[PDB]
């Protein structure tokens, strides 16, 4: 497939990644920069994030889904279903609303595209109606992360996709904080893209710290694999 070749060929090896986030949650302002690399052949991403404005006013785990679905490993028999790569190099816009149960919401807008050889994720995030002393602004979430399926469907009339899933963040008392995610992606360019049958991505995420780093930061390792079209 002379289309399944173009975006694909862009991802065949290890690709440098840059991430930039402008944030404002309940008027608490912050910026984050991330760097690392993705290897879509194995669905592998390695990233480190720094809050460049000082203290991150929200828990690092809450930003994991916001901080690269073009790095998913699509099985060969599911390559016609890979919208994310099909939109490259011109890229795509990824929008979300994330509803924290019994608390506030994040609304995000991102552009994901190549800048030269580097795959870049530029993000603006606004959250509102957070509780000052709730699990998010009150930093009550554990520094860890659970594995989660992400369900994709075509959004045929917007020429893109819709993605919906639930994240449960472990709270330090042993309970969980639900983060209900609603997502839409649409290509930046006017050229053809792959519009997938229903399927899902399996995500595994591992959080850590860099022992030499004094800045407020997070090290993220992720594995991601498309499935559900047997």
Describe what you observe in this structure:
- The chain is mostly beta strands.
- The chain has one domain (1-230): Green fluorescent protein (Green Fluorescent Protein), CATH 2.40.155.
- It is built from 3 helices and 11 strands; from the N terminus they run H-E-E-E-H-H-E-E-E-E-E-E-E-E.
- The protein has an 11-stranded mixed beta barrel with strand order 1-2-3-11-10-7-8-9-4-5-6.
- Strand 2 and strand 3 (44-51) form a beta hairpin.
- The longest helix has 4 residues, at 6-9.
- The radius of gyration is 17 Å and the shape is globular.
- The two termini are 20 Å apart.
- The PDB classes it as luminescent protein.
- Keywords: beta barrel, fluorescent protein, high pressure.
- It forms a monomeric assembly.
- The entry is titled "Structure of the Yellow Fluorescent Protein Citrine Frozen at 2000 Atmospheres Number 1: Structure 20 in a Series of 26 High Pressure Structures".
CATH first level:
Mainly Beta
Strand content range: over 45%
Q: Considering the protein shown, what is the CATH homologous superfamily? A: Green fluorescent protein
How many independent structural domains? Answer: 1
Strand order of the largest sheet: 1-2-3-11-10-7-8-9-4-5-6
User: CATH architecture, please?
Assistant: Beta Barrel
* Straight-line N-to-C gap: 20 Å
- Estimate the global geometry from the Cα principal axes: globular
Q: Could you give the count of β-strands?
A: 11
Kindly report the CATH topology. Green Fluorescent Protein
Our Rg estimate from Cα atoms comes to 17 Å
Q: H/E series, N to C?
A: HEEEHHEEEEEEEE
Question: Biggest sheet, open or closed, and with what strands and sense?
Answer: 11 strands, mixed, barrel
Helix content: under 10%
> How many alpha or pi helices?
3
Report the structural category: mainly beta
Function: Energy-transfer acceptor. Its role is to transduce the blue chemiluminescence of the protein aequorin into green fluorescent light by energy transfer. Fluoresces in vivo upon receiving energy from the Ca(2+)-activated photoprotein aequorin.
Subunit structure: Monomer.
Protein name: Green fluorescent protein
InterPro entries: GFP (IPR009017), GFP-related (IPR011584), Green_fluorescent_prot (IPR000786)
């Amino acid at each position: 497939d002379p289309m399944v070749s173009k975006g694909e060929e862009l991802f065949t090896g290890v690709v440098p990644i840059l991430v930039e986030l402008d944030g404002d949650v309940n008027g608490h302002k912050f910026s984050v920069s991330g760097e690392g690399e993705g290897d879509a052949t194995y669905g592998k991403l390695t990233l480190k994030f720094i809050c460049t404005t000082g203290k991150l006013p929200v828990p690092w785990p809450t930003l994991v889904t916001t901080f690269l679905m073009c790095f998913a490993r699509y099985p060969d028999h599911m390559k016609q279903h890979d919208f994310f790569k099909s939109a490259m190099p011109e890229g795509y816009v990824q929008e979300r609303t994330i509803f924290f149960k019994d608390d506030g919401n994040y609304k995000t807008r991102a552009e994901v595209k190549f800048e030269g050889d580097t795959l870049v994720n530029r993000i603006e995030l606004k959250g509102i109606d957070f509780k000052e002393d709730g699990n998010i602004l009150g930093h009550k979430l554990e520094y860890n992360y659970n594995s989660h399926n992400v369900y994709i469907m075509a959004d045929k009339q917007k020429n893109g996709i819709k993605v919906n899933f639930k994240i449960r963040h472990n709270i330090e008392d042993g309970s969980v904080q639900l983060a209900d995610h609603y997502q839409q992606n649409t290509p930046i360019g006017d050229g053809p893209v792959l519009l997938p049958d229903n399927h899902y991505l399996s995500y595994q995420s591992a959080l850590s710290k860099d022992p030499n780093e004094k800045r407020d930061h997070m090290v993220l390792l992720e594995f991601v694999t498309a499935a559900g079209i047997t």
